[PDB]
Scaffold this motif. Structure first.
Motif, PDB file in Angstrom:
ATOM      1  N   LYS A 297       0.856  -1.175   0.000  1.00 52.81           N
ATOM      2  CA  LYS A 297       0.000   0.000   0.000  1.00 52.81           C
ATOM      3  C   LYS A 297       0.895   1.229   0.000  1.00 52.81           C
ATOM      4  O   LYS A 297       1.946   1.233   0.644  1.00 52.81           O
ATOM      5  CB  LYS A 297      -0.940   0.021   1.215  1.00 52.81           C
ATOM      6  CG  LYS A 297      -1.983  -1.088   1.217  1.00 52.81           C
ATOM      7  CD  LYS A 297      -2.740  -1.142   2.537  1.00 52.81           C
ATOM      8  CE  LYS A 297      -4.197  -0.723   2.394  1.00 52.81           C
ATOM      9  NZ  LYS A 297      -4.341   0.723   2.072  1.00 52.81           N
TER      10      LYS A 297
ATOM     11  N   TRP D 101      -6.898   3.863   7.174  1.00 51.58           N
ATOM     12  CA  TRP D 101      -6.990   2.512   6.625  1.00 51.58           C
ATOM     13  C   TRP D 101      -8.018   1.676   7.377  1.00 51.58           C
ATOM     14  O   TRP D 101      -8.723   0.858   6.774  1.00 51.58           O
ATOM     15  CB  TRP D 101      -5.628   1.821   6.674  1.00 51.58           C
ATOM     16  CG  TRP D 101      -4.590   2.434   5.801  1.00 51.58           C
ATOM     17  CD1 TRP D 101      -4.757   3.466   4.926  1.00 51.58           C
ATOM     18  CD2 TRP D 101      -3.215   2.051   5.715  1.00 51.58           C
ATOM     19  NE1 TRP D 101      -3.566   3.754   4.303  1.00 51.58           N
ATOM     20  CE2 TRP D 101      -2.604   2.897   4.770  1.00 51.58           C
ATOM     21  CE3 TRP D 101      -2.439   1.076   6.348  1.00 51.58           C
ATOM     22  CZ2 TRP D 101      -1.253   2.797   4.443  1.00 51.58           C
ATOM     23  CZ3 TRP D 101      -1.102   0.978   6.021  1.00 51.58           C
ATOM     24  CH2 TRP D 101      -0.522   1.832   5.080  1.00 51.58           C
ATOM     25  N   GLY D 102      -8.114   1.865   8.694  1.00 55.10           N
ATOM     26  CA  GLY D 102      -8.989   1.045   9.516  1.00 55.10           C
ATOM     27  C   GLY D 102     -10.465   1.198   9.214  1.00 55.10           C
ATOM     28  O   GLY D 102     -11.244   0.290   9.523  1.00 55.10           O
ATOM     29  N   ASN D 103     -10.874   2.322   8.627  1.00 56.18           N
ATOM     30  CA  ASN D 103     -12.258   2.515   8.214  1.00 56.18           C
ATOM     31  C   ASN D 103     -12.371   2.737   6.709  1.00 56.18           C
ATOM     32  O   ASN D 103     -13.226   3.495   6.248  1.00 56.18           O
ATOM     33  CB  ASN D 103     -12.905   3.666   8.983  1.00 56.18           C
ATOM     34  CG  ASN D 103     -11.989   4.855   9.131  1.00 56.18           C
ATOM     35  OD1 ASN D 103     -11.431   5.356   8.150  1.00 56.18           O
ATOM     36  ND2 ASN D 103     -11.819   5.312  10.365  1.00 56.18           N
ATOM     37  N   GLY D 104     -11.507   2.082   5.935  1.00 54.40           N
ATOM     38  CA  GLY D 104     -11.657   2.008   4.498  1.00 54.40           C
ATOM     39  C   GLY D 104     -11.093   3.151   3.685  1.00 54.40           C
ATOM     40  O   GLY D 104     -11.407   3.246   2.496  1.00 54.40           O
TER      41      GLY D 104
ATOM     42  N   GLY E  29     -14.681   5.031  -3.735  1.00 58.44           N
ATOM     43  CA  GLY E  29     -14.535   5.952  -2.628  1.00 58.44           C
ATOM     44  C   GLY E  29     -13.973   5.345  -1.358  1.00 58.44           C
ATOM     45  O   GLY E  29     -13.552   6.075  -0.457  1.00 58.44           O
ATOM     46  N   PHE E  30     -13.961   4.018  -1.269  1.00 64.97           N
ATOM     47  CA  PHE E  30     -13.562   3.349  -0.039  1.00 64.97           C
ATOM     48  C   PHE E  30     -12.869   2.039  -0.370  1.00 64.97           C
ATOM     49  O   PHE E  30     -13.142   1.416  -1.399  1.00 64.97           O
ATOM     50  CB  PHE E  30     -14.763   3.074   0.879  1.00 64.97           C
ATOM     51  CG  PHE E  30     -15.579   4.293   1.196  1.00 64.97           C
ATOM     52  CD1 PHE E  30     -15.163   5.184   2.164  1.00 64.97           C
ATOM     53  CD2 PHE E  30     -16.758   4.549   0.518  1.00 64.97           C
ATOM     54  CE1 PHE E  30     -15.907   6.312   2.454  1.00 64.97           C
ATOM     55  CE2 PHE E  30     -17.508   5.674   0.804  1.00 64.97           C
ATOM     56  CZ  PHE E  30     -17.079   6.557   1.774  1.00 64.97           C
ATOM     57  N   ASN E  31     -11.974   1.622   0.524  1.00 68.80           N
ATOM     58  CA  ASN E  31     -11.326   0.324   0.421  1.00 68.80           C
ATOM     59  C   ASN E  31     -12.181  -0.799   0.978  1.00 68.80           C
ATOM     60  O   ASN E  31     -11.658  -1.892   1.220  1.00 68.80           O
ATOM     61  CB  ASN E  31      -9.976   0.351   1.138  1.00 68.80           C
ATOM     62  CG  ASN E  31      -8.864   0.894   0.266  1.00 68.80           C
ATOM     63  OD1 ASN E  31      -9.051   1.857  -0.481  1.00 68.80           O
ATOM     64  ND2 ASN E  31      -7.692   0.278   0.361  1.00 68.80           N
ATOM     65  N   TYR E  32     -13.472  -0.554   1.192  1.00 69.64           N
ATOM     66  CA  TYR E  32     -14.364  -1.543   1.786  1.00 69.64           C
ATOM     67  C   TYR E  32     -14.896  -2.498   0.733  1.00 69.64           C
ATOM     68  O   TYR E  32     -16.081  -2.823   0.715  1.00 69.64           O
ATOM     69  CB  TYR E  32     -15.527  -0.842   2.476  1.00 69.64           C
ATOM     70  CG  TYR E  32     -15.331  -0.441   3.922  1.00 69.64           C
ATOM     71  CD1 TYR E  32     -15.045  -1.385   4.897  1.00 69.64           C
ATOM     72  CD2 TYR E  32     -15.478   0.883   4.314  1.00 69.64           C
ATOM     73  CE1 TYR E  32     -14.886  -1.017   6.218  1.00 69.64           C
ATOM     74  CE2 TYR E  32     -15.323   1.260   5.625  1.00 69.64           C
ATOM     75  CZ  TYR E  32     -15.026   0.309   6.576  1.00 69.64           C
ATOM     76  OH  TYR E  32     -14.870   0.687   7.892  1.00 69.64           O
ATOM     77  N   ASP E  50     -10.669  -5.829   1.996  1.00 68.29           N
ATOM     78  CA  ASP E  50      -9.734  -4.709   1.897  1.00 68.29           C
ATOM     79  C   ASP E  50      -8.929  -4.838   0.622  1.00 68.29           C
ATOM     80  O   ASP E  50      -7.722  -4.784   0.597  1.00 68.29           O
ATOM     81  CB  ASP E  50      -8.804  -4.679   3.079  1.00 68.29           C
ATOM     82  CG  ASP E  50      -8.114  -3.353   3.245  1.00 68.29           C
ATOM     83  OD1 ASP E  50      -8.788  -2.357   3.485  1.00 68.29           O
ATOM     84  OD2 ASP E  50      -6.888  -3.302   3.154  1.00 68.29           O
TER      85      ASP E  50
ATOM     86  N   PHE F 109     -18.624   2.503  11.511  1.00 70.93           N
ATOM     87  CA  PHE F 109     -17.765   2.058  10.464  1.00 70.93           C
ATOM     88  C   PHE F 109     -17.506   0.588  10.673  1.00 70.93           C
ATOM     89  O   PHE F 109     -17.080   0.196  11.761  1.00 70.93           O
ATOM     90  CB  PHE F 109     -16.454   2.836  10.477  1.00 70.93           C
ATOM     91  CG  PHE F 109     -16.619   4.304  10.186  1.00 70.93           C
ATOM     92  CD1 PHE F 109     -16.028   5.259  10.996  1.00 70.93           C
ATOM     93  CD2 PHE F 109     -17.360   4.725   9.097  1.00 70.93           C
ATOM     94  CE1 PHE F 109     -16.170   6.602  10.721  1.00 70.93           C
ATOM     95  CE2 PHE F 109     -17.506   6.073   8.816  1.00 70.93           C
ATOM     96  CZ  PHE F 109     -16.910   7.010   9.629  1.00 70.93           C
ATOM     97  N   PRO F 110     -17.817  -0.238   9.717  1.00 71.67           N
ATOM     98  CA  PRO F 110     -17.580  -1.674   9.866  1.00 71.67           C
ATOM     99  C   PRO F 110     -16.093  -1.972   9.897  1.00 71.67           C
ATOM    100  O   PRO F 110     -15.263  -1.060   9.816  1.00 71.67           O
ATOM    101  CB  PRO F 110     -18.255  -2.262   8.622  1.00 71.67           C
ATOM    102  CG  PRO F 110     -18.222  -1.159   7.631  1.00 71.67           C
ATOM    103  CD  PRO F 110     -18.363   0.110   8.400  1.00 71.67           C
ATOM    104  N   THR F 111     -15.746  -3.241  10.019  1.00 75.94           N
ATOM    105  CA  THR F 111     -14.360  -3.659   9.926  1.00 75.94           C
ATOM    106  C   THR F 111     -14.085  -4.178   8.519  1.00 75.94           C
ATOM    107  O   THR F 111     -14.984  -4.673   7.834  1.00 75.94           O
ATOM    108  CB  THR F 111     -14.034  -4.724  10.976  1.00 75.94           C
ATOM    109  OG1 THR F 111     -14.555  -5.991  10.568  1.00 75.94           O
ATOM    110  CG2 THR F 111     -14.647  -4.349  12.312  1.00 75.94           C
ATOM    111  N   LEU F 112     -12.830  -4.038   8.088  1.00 80.34           N
ATOM    112  CA  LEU F 112     -12.469  -4.394   6.720  1.00 80.34           C
ATOM    113  C   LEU F 112     -12.810  -5.844   6.403  1.00 80.34           C
ATOM    114  O   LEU F 112     -13.099  -6.172   5.246  1.00 80.34           O
ATOM    115  CB  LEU F 112     -10.979  -4.134   6.498  1.00 80.34           C
ATOM    116  CG  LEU F 112     -10.513  -2.713   6.793  1.00 80.34           C
ATOM    117  CD1 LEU F 112      -9.021  -2.548   6.555  1.00 80.34           C
ATOM    118  CD2 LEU F 112     -11.297  -1.744   5.936  1.00 80.34           C
TER     119      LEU F 112
END
Ligand SMILES: *[C@@H]1O[C@H](CO[C@@H]2O[C@@H](C)[C@@H](O)[C@@H](O)[C@@H]2O)[C@@H](O)[C@H](O)[C@H]1NC(C)=O
Ligand SMILES: *[C@@H]1O[C@H](CO[C@@H]2O[C@@H](C)[C@@H](O)[C@@H](O)[C@@H]2O)[C@@H](O)[C@H](O)[C@H]1NC(C)=O
Lengths: 377, 110, 127, 377, 110, 127
Positions: A297, D101-104, E29-32, E50, F109-112
Motif C-alpha cells: 500500500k 486505513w482502519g475505516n476504508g 470511494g472506499f477500500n471496503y 480490503d 464504520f464496519p471492519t475491513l
C-alpha cells in the motif's frame, strides 16, 4: 495499530534506560507509550462507569391534576374543609369569595372557599448519589502490532487499582492506576432525565424549584412542594382555578448547558504508571533479513506527521527482521513500530515511523526500496 | 342525608308543618333550601325556594322558615288537593344537591 | 312556554347501558345547566348531576361518578344522560331540571330558584 | 340588584340636575349609577372578545426526530451529500471525523460527514394578529330592582359604539362608549398555547428563540430555524448525534409571568357616558302608602356600608309607594333603590340604603318599623 | 448497483480476472471492497477483503486490486475446484452494503 | 470454532409473516452486529440489514425498511429476522453474517473483514 487513525493521539517516550512511563488517560484520547529496547504499546481509557447509584431525591418536571373538588362556606361560618386536605396526593389552596343573598348567604361579605385537586406527576428526573468505591474504569492496552489482524482490557477499581496484564509473545505489563477525580462525590449528584445524564453540584440540585420526594418504593409516590407546578388563583372573587405549569424539561436543559454531560457511564480522567520490567519485545532472537520488499500500500501519512509503510517480502527466510533506516547521510530515524519483524512472508506488515522534517529518504539491502518523503511542519 | 317524617296528616281548614333536618353543611349553612310538591306519577313542582320565596302561581297558604339545621314548610287553610308528597332540597357546601326522604301528606274527610 | 321533554319509557336488563334524552324549549338552552335526578317507585329523589350547556362542563355525584355521563348537543337544545353497568336498584323515574348559569357563563353557585322547571320523567326498568 | 353582592363595586352619582353620568367599566367591576329623580342602574363590562384573529406566525415548543441518515466520505474526497439536504422537513449538520486505513480510507485525516434527520414538531403555540375593528364588548345594564325576581346587554363595536337600550317600564337609555385600549394592536400579538392565551409586545414575540413558520395551510408544515430545538454534536471525531431540546412549555410560562393573561376573549377597559333623558323612574304616579310593613329578612349590610331591607306590606292598596326615611332628628338618607314601590302586596321588595355614620334609626306611619342600625367606619 | 460480468471461463494453469464496477460512493470511494466464493447451495465464503487482504486459509493464487470505480479479483494457477460463483461486496458512503450480480466461473477440461 | 446456525427450511404463502433465527457460538455475541442478506435461487446477494447485538440498534435497507424487523435475544446468543407481507419475489436463501463492533460498543464504520463468518442459509418459499 489502535491510535494511528485517531487524531487526539499522544506520544509518551521514556528517557534513557527507563523501565516505565507515566501516562494520563482521558476519554477520546489514545496514547502510545515507547521505551528503548521495549515494545511500543497503545493505551486508552474507553469508559468509566459507576455501578449501583442510589436515588437521593426524585424531582418532577411535568405534572397534571384530576378530581377537582371545592368546599365553600358563607361569611361568619368558618373556614372551608375537605377530607382531601390530609390526603398527600392532593394539592390545595384556601381563599375567600363574594357572598350574599344571591348565593344563599344570609350575610353579605367574604366567605371561605377551599379548592383541592389530585396531583399526578407525569414525568420526572432523578438525582442519584454516586460513590467512589463503586467506580470502575475500563482501560485497554494493546501492542503496536507491526503485523496485520489475521482472520487486552483491564478493570480498575479504587480497591484494585493495580492490574497485571499478560501480553502474549511479549510478557507481562503491570499497570498502576490512580483515579484522579476532579470531584467530591458527596458534594455532587448524578442527575438523569429521560435518557440523558449530567452530574452537577449537589446544593444546586437540592435548590432546584421543582416538587420532590425521597422516593422510596415502600410508600406510594406523594410529592412535597406541589406548589412549584400546581397553584391556584381566584377569578374575580367567586371562582378558583388550578394553574399547572407545564413540562420543565426544556427549562432543565437550558439550565444544564453549563454542566458536564454524559451500570451508569461517565467521563473522567485517570493517571497511571506502566512498569514493563517483565516485558520483552519479541523478535530480538531473529536475524536481519536477506531479500527485497515491495509496497503493498502506498506510503500514508497520519495526522501526527508520522507515516505508515506496509510491505510484503522477498526471500527464503520465513522468520526474520526488516532492515530499516532513513537518510537526508543516514540518521537512525525514530520508529514507533518497534523491531519490525517478518512473522510470515505470506502476510504483509506495517511499520510506522517518524521521518525528519523537510526531505527524507526511507530505505528498507541489495535491491532495497528508496521511498522519497517530505514533511512540511 | 336530609331527614323528614314519613307521613303527616290533618283535616280541612287546619294548618300543618313538615320539617326537614340536615347539616351545618347543607341546610343550616345556606339559604339554598326549597320545597317541592309531587303528585303520583308527576314531576316534582317547585313551591318554595330560598326558604320563604314562592314562585308566581303558588298561593299564600304555603310558607317556609328555617331554624338551626331544620327547614319547615307549612300549609294553612288545608285543602283536599294539597294531598301529595312533599320533598325538601338543599344545596350543600361541596356544590352538590341533597333531598329529603319525602313525606306523604294525607288529608282526611271529616 | 318553558318545557322540558324526555325520551320514551325504556326497559333494559342488567349489564347494558341506558341513554335518556332531554330536549328544552321556551328558553335559550345554552344559558342553563341541566341537572338529572332519579327516584325509584315510591322512594326519594336522588340528585345525579348536572352539565353546563354552554361549555359542556360536568359535575357528578359520588354514587354515580364513573357510572353516569351527562352530555349536551346544543344544535337540538338537548342534554343526554347515560348510565353504565346497570344493576338491581337502577329502576327509576329519571328527571331533568334546569338552573340558570351566571352572567359570565360559569356554574359555581346555583340560583335560589334552582329546578324551577322539570321534565316529566322516564322509567328505566331492570329485569 | 346585580352589584350589591359584588365587592369590587363603584357608585357614580351625577351632580345636581344631571341627565347623564360618565362611568368607567373594567372587568370584575360592577358600577351602580344614580341621578336624582332617575332610576338607579347597574352596569358591568362582562367580556370583551375579538372575532376572527389571523395567525401571524406559529412557533413550535416541542419537536422530535425520525429517519436519521448519514453520508460520509474519506479525506481528499469532498463533502458529504444527502438528497434530504433540500427536503425542508429535514434538519442537518455537516462536520468531519477521523478516517484512515482502519475505516476504508487510503489516506489518514479528516473526512466529511453529514447527518440529516426528519424534523417533526410535536406541540406548538401561535401568535395571532388582532384588529381593533373586530373587537366587540359585551356591556350589561340593569335597573336597581326594588322588586324580587319573579318565577339587558348591548354589543359594542368600534364601528357601532353607541347602543340604544330599551328598559321596560322605565324608558330608553342611550349608552355611548369609547374603547380605551391601552395597546397598539399592530405592535402586540395574541399568543395562545395549549388552552391558554396572553397578549404581548410583538417584537418580543418575533425575537423568541423557537422554530417558526408563517403557517399557511396551502403548503405542508416546514420549519425555519430548526436548530433552536434540534442540533448535532460530534462524539469524539467519529460519530454525530442529534440533540433534541425538550418541550419549552414551562420555559414559556416562566417567560410569560410578567405578561397579561386571559371568538377569542380578552380583558380591557371601556369609558362610557349614559344619557337618561328618555328615562323615567316608574312609580312616580303612585301614592305614598297607608299600612305597616314587616321584615321578611333581617337587615343585612353589604361590603359597602350600605344595608339591605326586604319587607312585606299591610293594607288594601295594591299599587303604592313606601314611606321611608331615617334619623339620628330626621335627615333624608341616601337611597340606592330609587322610589321604593309596592308592585304586588303579595310579593316582598328590597330597599338598599346608605345610612349615616354611627347610630341611625331607619323608619318605614302608624305602627311603622323602627330598625336600629349602626355603622362603624 | 454493483456490476460485473455474468460468466467467465478459463482452463487449468491459466490466470483469469473478474471485475466489479461501482460508484464514487461505494467502490471508488472506499477500500471496503471484498470478494466472496459461493458454491452451489453453500454460504458465500470470504476470500478477499480490503481489496488485497486474504483471510488465513486462502492461498496466494487469489489476489485483488482496485482501479477507479472497478475492483478486480483474479485467480492464478487455475484449478478445477475454483469452479464457482464469485461476488464482490462494498460498503457505501451511506453506511449500507451492496453486492454485484455474481459471475459464474467455469473451468473446462482441456 | 466460530459458528452461525439458522432455523429450519420454512414455506409460508403470501400475506403471512416469516421469522428466521440465527444463533452464534464461538465468540461473544454482544461484541458483533448481525447482518441479514438474502438471495433468490440463482441470483445475486441482496443486503437486508443489521442489528447491534450490544444495544439493539438496527439499520435497514430501503427496499425492506418497513417490511423487515431484526431483533436480538442476548440470553441465547440469538438474532432474529422477520419479514412482513410476503409477495411473489420473496423466495430466497436467507443468511446471517457477523461483523465486529468497535471498542466503544458502537457500529458506525464496519471492519475491513466484514462478513467473515456466515450462517448456512434458510429458504423462505412462496406459493
Ligand atoms: C379522578 O379521575 C380519574 C381519571 O382522571 C380523569 O377522569 C375524568 C374526570 C376525565 O375528565 C379526565 O380528566 C381524567 O381521565 C377517574 O377515575 C375519576 O374521574 C376520578 N377517580 C376517582 C374518583 O377515584
Ligand atoms: C421514518 O419513521 C417512520 C416512523 O417514525 C419512527 O419509525 C421507526 C424508525 C421507530 O423507530 C420510531 O422512531 C418512529 O415510529 C416510519 O414510517 C419509517 O421508519 C420512516 N418513514 C419513511 C422512511 O417513510
Amino acid at each position: 495499530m489502535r491510535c494511528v487513525g485517531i487524531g487526539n493521539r499522544d506520544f509518551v517516550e521514556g528517557l534513557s534506560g527507563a523501565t516505565w512511563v507515566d501516562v494520563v488517560l482521558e476519554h477520546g484520547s489514545c496514547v502510545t507509550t515507547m521505551a528503548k529496547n521495549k515494545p511500543t504499546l497503545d493505551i486508552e481509557l474507553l469508559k468509566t462507569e459507576v455501578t449501583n447509584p442510589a436515588v437521593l431525591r426524585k424531582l418532577c418536571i411535568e405534572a397534571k391534576i384530576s378530581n377537582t373538588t371545592t368546599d365553600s362556606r358563607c361569611p361568619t361560618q368558618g373556614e372551608a374543609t375537605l377530607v382531601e386536605e390530609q390526603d398527600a396526593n392532593f394539592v390545595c389552596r384556601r381563599t375567600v369569595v363574594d357572598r350574599g343573598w344571591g348565593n344563599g348567604c344570609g350575610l353579605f361579605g367574604k366567605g371561605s372557599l377551599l379548592t383541592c385537586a389530585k396531583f399526578k406527576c407525569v414525568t420526572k428526573l432523578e438525582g442519584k448519589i454516586v460513590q467512589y468505591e463503586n467506580l470502575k474504569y475500563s482501560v485497554i492496552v494493546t501492542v503496536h502490532t507491526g503485523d496485520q489482524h489475521q482472520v487486552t482490557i483491564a478493570t480498575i477499581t479504587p480497591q484494585a487499582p493495580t492490574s497485571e496484564i499478560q501480553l502474549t509473545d511479549y510478557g507481562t505489563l503491570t499497570l498502576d492506576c490512580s483515579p484522579r477525580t476532579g470531584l467530591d462525590f458527596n458534594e455532587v449528584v448524578l442527575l438523569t432525565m429521560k435518557e440523558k445524564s449530567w452530574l452537577v453540584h449537589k446544593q444546586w440540585f437540592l435548590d432546584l424549584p421543582l416538587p420532590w420526594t425521597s422516593g422510596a418504593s415502600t410508600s406510594q409516590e406523594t410529592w412535597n412542594r406541589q406548589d412549584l407546578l400546581v397553584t391556584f388563583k381566584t377569578a374575580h372573587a367567586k371562582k378558583q382555578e388550578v394553574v399547572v405549569l407545564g413540562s420543565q424539561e426544556g427549562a432543565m436543559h437550558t439550565a444544564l448547558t453549563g454542566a458536564t454531560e454524559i451500570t451508569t457511564i461517565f467521563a473522567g480522567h485517570l493517571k497511571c504508571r506502566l512498569k514493563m520490567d517483565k516485558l520483552t519485545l519479541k523478535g530480538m532472537s531473529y536475524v536481519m533479513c536477506t531479500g527485497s520488499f515491495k509496497l503493498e500500500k502506498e506510503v500514508a501519512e497520519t495526522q501526527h506527521g508520522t507515516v505508515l509503510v506496509q510491505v510484503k517480502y522477498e526471500g527464503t527466510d520465513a522468520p526474520c527482521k526488516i532492515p530499516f533506516s532513513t537518510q537526508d547521510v543516514t540518521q537512525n530515524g525514530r520508529l514507533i513500530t518497534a523491531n519490525p519483524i517478518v512473522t510470515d512472508k505470506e502476510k504483509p506488515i506495517n511499520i510506522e515511523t517518524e521521518p525528519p522534517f523537510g526531505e527524507s529518504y526511507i530505505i528498507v539491502g541489495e535491491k532495497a526500496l528508496k521511498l522519497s518523503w517530505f514533511k512540511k511542519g | 342525608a336530609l331527614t323528614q317524617p314519613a307521613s303527616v296528616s290533618g283535616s280541612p281548614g287546619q294548618s300543618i308543618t313538615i320539617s326537614c333536618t340536615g347539616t351545618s353543611s347543607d341546610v343550616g349553612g345556606f339559604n339554598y333550601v326549597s320545597w317541592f310538591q309531587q303528585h303520583p306519577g308527576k314531576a316534582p313542582k317547585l313551591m318554595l325556594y330560598d326558604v320563604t320565596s314562592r314562585p308566581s302561581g303558588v298561593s299564600s297558604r304555603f310558607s317556609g322558615s328555617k331554624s338551626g339545621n331544620t327547614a319547615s314548610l307549612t300549609i294553612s287553610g288545608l285543602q283536599a288537593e294539597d294531598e301529595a308528597d312533599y320533598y325538601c332540597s338543599s344545596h350543600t357546601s361541596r356544590g352538590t344537591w341533597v333531598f329529603g326522604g319525602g313525606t306523604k301528606l294525607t288529608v282526611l274527610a271529616a | 312556554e318553558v318545557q322540558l321533554v324526555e325520551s320514551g319509557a325504556e326497559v333494559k336488563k342488567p349489564g347494558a347501558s341506558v341513554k335518556v334524552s332531554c330536549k328544552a324549549s321556551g328558553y335559550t338552552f345554552t344559558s342553563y345547566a341541566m341537572h338529572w335526578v332519579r327516584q325509584a317507585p315510591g322512594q326519594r329523589l336522588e340528585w345525579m348531576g348536572w352539565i353546563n350547556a354552554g361549555n359542556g362542563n360536568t359535575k357528578y355525584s359520588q354514587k354515580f361518578q364513573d357510572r353516569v355521563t351527562i352530555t349536551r348537543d346544543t344544535s337540538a337544545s338537548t342534554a343526554y344522560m347515560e348510565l353504565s353497568s346497570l344493576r338491581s336498584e337502577d329502576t327509576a323515574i329519571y328527571y331533568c331540571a334546569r338552573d340558570k348559569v351566571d352572567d359570565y357563563g360559569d356554574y359555581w353557585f346555583p340560583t335560589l330558584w334552582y329546578f324551577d322547571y322539570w321534565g316529566q320523567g322516564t322509567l328505566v326498568t331492570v329485569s
